[model samples]
Target chain A: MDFPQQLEACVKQANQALSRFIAPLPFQNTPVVETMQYGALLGGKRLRPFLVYATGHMFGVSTNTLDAPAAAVECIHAYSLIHDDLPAMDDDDLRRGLPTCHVKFGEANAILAGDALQTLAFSILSDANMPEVSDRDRISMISELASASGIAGMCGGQALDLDAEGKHVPLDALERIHRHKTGALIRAAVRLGALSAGDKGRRALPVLDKYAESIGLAFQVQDDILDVVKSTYPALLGLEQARKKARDLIDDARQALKQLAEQSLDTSALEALADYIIQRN
Target chain B: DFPQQLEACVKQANQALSRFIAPLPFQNTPVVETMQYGALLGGKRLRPFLVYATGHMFGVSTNTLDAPAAAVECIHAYSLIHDDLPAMDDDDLRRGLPTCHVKFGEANAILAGDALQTLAFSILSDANMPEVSDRDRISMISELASASGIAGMCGGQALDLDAEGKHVPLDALERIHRHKTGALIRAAVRLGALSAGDKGRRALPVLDKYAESIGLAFQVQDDILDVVGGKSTYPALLGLEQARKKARDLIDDARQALKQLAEQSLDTSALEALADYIIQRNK
Candidate 1:
């Protein structure tokens, strides 16, 4: 399968959709929109958005119909990355292989940009997506995304990770952190796509959950393997064990892909994507 | 009557917001604590009351009004937190207490403000927001986004910052306040009216007029609290006597707008009383 072909096309579509949403920020004031544009427009692989499109595609919704929410999720991802890089958070001065938002803009402006982007994400999901879509479905789409981004999801995970810093936590505690900090939003991305599928989304959810859970773990585990500060999954599970764990998670993700394919869903793209994740250098 | 209702609104809004605290991430952390503190500081809750009073006046249920009411206060709370940041006013006190940044440290205060704003949007967009149809829910969210964004309160703040240390005329001052303090206030009333659907919407234009005047009167009275000259306050730009006169006139205008709605059988008493309280309060 041509994984790069799908990825390239998906990234272009995601960029266009994100641009459509991010363009009209209220520009009357400070660098709020400036910082926002820097962060939101910063180049990423658009992997989360691809998950939305890939899953929603099987349901046969128009890519145009999925554009607003697909962009909305990316905004959530971008905003989180921006906040996580703040001086009070990780204090990183670079992101997306570029200068971090707070480094480019002042810290106060960076903070405001993150806040506004989060609001913009919800605004895009609820309003500008498509009036043809039923309100019930849109609300569901919103609640799914909001819950993932909020306290019980990413926020909770970050708080737990902060609490665990410089400490010896067991494997279960580590998994809990990764699950909330990273897994929740990943899961939400897949679910948002499935939801865009409507009722087929409901039937597809169980296997989709299996696939999402594995990839979410595999993504984090691979990052741990790749990071210079590799004290996370590798340190706890040992480097060989971490590699095996990631490989196994990817294998499990494929198993679910097969399950979907057998269930008469065209999941070859998702299957290719699973291989793509495991193969990411 | 007005003071009692104001106090009650503040208390209930604080209590309602506090209910969302326990389940939040990092329950005991400073971020969560400051978020709650920023939201729960219990100022007059004038915005929440506008939500409730307007909805109630239009015969909407209290439960239906609660979300917008609570949501407005959260938005108000976040603006106050940001306004007090060192990059802005550097205020040390607010809500008759230590500001969130002063109490919780700057970074966490910023996070708290961020969280509060997110929760405000979340509250409005929640599928379970009482009695509001999906259409109305989206409308409330749109109103809030524009009002909170650069076109609204944030825009007003920028103008206010730009005007600092400069002598501006009364018209400019009004523009700044209309965006700064008045935008969210207007949105709050608009949300309340929208919460009640058509019964509420029929009065939208008049209620907005009422809210606009009330917002102006509140800023004018806040300006009145200063002992003497300051920068660009209503009284500073327009002389104190003229400012006081303006406040009275605005309140009278606000009451007149509410009276126009009274013919539609919208209860006008609480609204008029709140308008009167805006200028009459000794704060």
Candidate 2:
């Protein structure tokens, strides 16, 4: 399948898995669970889960084993978006053409929903049904998601981004903020997939890191180009320079993927994903 | 160490929690600063005390206990930071000081709470505990997350929100506290026990019983202290005298559970003392 088709399939799987995870238990808080559903289940590209599947499949791991981490990384992503769009944060009214969590529910419930989602991510990772994965790797995956999602990674990046708001920031500072904010979790998604295959997948970390970092930044540069705005790549470097930079980054991503091919690993989906990250409008 | 040892636990908890946030990755932004402020706000550190007291009972080292000790407090502190938001409890003061949002602004406060919750999981996952196996460490993470999430603390908060302006029955109110405050308290005890490995696992059922009694006892005492207006607390539903009686009764039950633990040849003194400490304090 093509990247979009493959991505669409991953999106369906992620939504199903996420919906099941946060679905109201008989004794759970209905309203809060509904808000959690609203925050997490509304459709996105599910790019994170796609990376999980694509990379895990490369290591011959089953999609069954991949679902937990796939859902988990997206949970962290979804929770971050919900919190980031809060009135005190970016204060966005709508996401995916629907009311944001805090906008749809009240602010307090929105905060609770985000809080619960963060816990749910860890909960899923900790108690997942992947018996094939050992306890050590499971804990390691939990560690990866936590480290990437926390102050050292996404939350830290968010704080830096918030700090840089309405002010002049150097390219170095912008890049640093985005790396922590966005790139960290992206790297984590691929890492989770790699870790799922155990040591074989573990051996590929350095190369996978290269691929993930390149596309992570490249994805942002294209977003900057599309946004036509901000203290972004397009704004800091000229649009042409930003476009050239994205091309260079994707080139780096593809180069890294080819190294995986040298290990006789299937690189088709990942190679296509790198191309799709730049080629998408 | 009723007063003195309690003070030591509080001091140690404060330091352990602080060390987690002190050398932050980024240049200290408001969010990072607020994480420090929120997590190390220096309350009673009762949760950390439970971790230490229970783990110490099983011959777990203080160093081995610090990670779970600090971790449980991270969850507790994050809950309070979010709990005090203008949209949530709407409190300006927490223990005579400004709430997180009031001190750091709403945006930073929210991010600070988020980061701290993330930090809790991170601490447990990354903690270096030679005594705790990887399986048990994962169990600790699982317990913490379950207790902190919709199934436990957050769910209870929602029940509390639903109870607002309405008169909830005593049992219903009990359910709310059991989830909100009680869940993490139980998890704190369980984490402490889990750090001791097999002996800890064997003691789980009784430890849970002990935790449950004191958990409610803690809230009952909070209710007896000053209580609330429309909010349904132990004192609100039951009268002040009845609330005090209720706390005494719960402490008695906690002691019974501790007695059971002692029969298993475990030192139950610290935990038993903590049960008394729950009802012994005033704001």
Candidate 3:
């Protein structure tokens, strides 16, 4: 099966789910909510949700059960983008070829919007109507998402990235930054998807984690190759070596899936996703 | 058994919260240190007191109650740090010390606040709650997020920002306060009760009414204390005598709520004293 069609379909599903959650009521027409909508609904690759859907699809989890986590992970991603673009952080003017949240909504609203979005992620996880999910599993999702999104994960990575600015970092340090920065959430996306399948899915977590790690790094390696920036994979490994590393990571990821197939779970969707990670622009 | 216990709760809160952040994930990072400073800063610990006192009503142990108590303080402390940012309240001092941003710089202050928010949810999801079902644990997380997020504190702050430099009416002012200070206070009581499991669930309505009264009363007393400050307070909008009466009336309402609890065979003495303290508090 081709990856692009599946990716497009999943992105639409994720956005629809997110819109249902972020829509303000008649009496709730406030700018912060507006900014939350703008930040969260911004059109990107929707890769995180794709991971959730693809990984969950392999375990035969219902798409309905996956939607909450699909939207929740994207919410955390959007909030991070908003905060990273703030004047205190990376301070970018443009995100996805449009003015960033702070530029359009003012810093105060942007900050509050980001704050609310973070809370919204947890709010969705704890309360979202996932009919098949047990109470214990739902709590596990919240716990997994929190550990990934918090200081042990994304927040810590961002701080490290900020600290590394204008300074050359070693390959290990650079990997640490990306692993926590982007990799944590990506790993979480896969885990959450597996988590939706309950005990049957729990059995595959360690192997799926390996798959997630490899693709997570491969995704960043390709981005560095395209951008060819300082302090990136291309910078440290050189262009040829970076491409080789990306190829190697894809192999590792597919190898992880091959073992999963040995366990009799379908792996075609995940295989396509691994290919798509390197194939993207 | 009353005010002295509150003082004890304050000390207990300080220790429990500090212990939560005591382990450093990475050495030489300023953000965790900032979290420690912001969270450990000695306040009245009123929120923790509410959690402990409310949980106490249903015989929930302090050890079992520590998780929610610490979690709520993290939210409260994080809110203060963010609110004091240059883009927000822009205060140089909190609790009479240099604010987080003032001492740690804006970037670290922001990260610390963000981390603390995550810590709140993390603590709730990870903390062990004996006799508390997974459903109740998830419920507590939902309650805390609802209180702290756009539907609650953040929403209140946005409205407050919108109301600045304008003639804010009393109804609009109450709406803002109800969501702002009132939401978290209400959550503390609810969380404490939730820790008690079914017994706490039974008392939810009465405790909510009691929480709502004291939440407003606490703010009105603050307004009286500052005359109490800028940006349209009860003293400014309702006048001094009227503001004092407003606080008095709220305390009476809170006492009435507690009386309902008393009728249910629950000992609400700690809450009763808290309601009195909310009205009669100086400084």
- Given candidate 2, what's the lDDT at residue B217? 91
Q: Which model scores highest in DockQ?
A: 2
The CAPRI category of model 1 is acceptable
For candidate 1, chain B by itself scores a TM value of: 0.95
Question: Per-residue CA lDDT of candidate 2, range A1-281, in tens?
Answer: 77778878888988877776766442454667788888888869899998998889898888888889999999999999988898889999999889999888888888988998899999999987986898889988999999999989999999888888888697888888888999999999999999999999999999999999889999988988888644888778898899999999999998998898999999988888877887766
Q: Candidate 2: which stretches are off by over 4 Å?
A: A24-29, B227-229
Worst 10 residues of 2 chain A by lDDT: A22-31
Clashing pairs in 3: none
Q: How many backbone clashes does candidate 2 have?
A: 0
- The alpha-carbon deviation from the true structure for residue A94 of candidate 3, after best TM-score superposition, in angstroms, is 0.5
- lDDT string for model 3 (B56-138, tens) is 88888888888999999999999999999989889998888999988988888988999999999988998888878887898
Backbone Cα, N, C clashes tallied per candidate: 0, 0, 0
After aligning candidate 1 to the native by TM-score, how far in Å is the CA of B261 from where it should be?
0.1
Candidate models: Cα lDDT each: 0.80, 0.88, 0.88
Candidate 3's docking class is medium
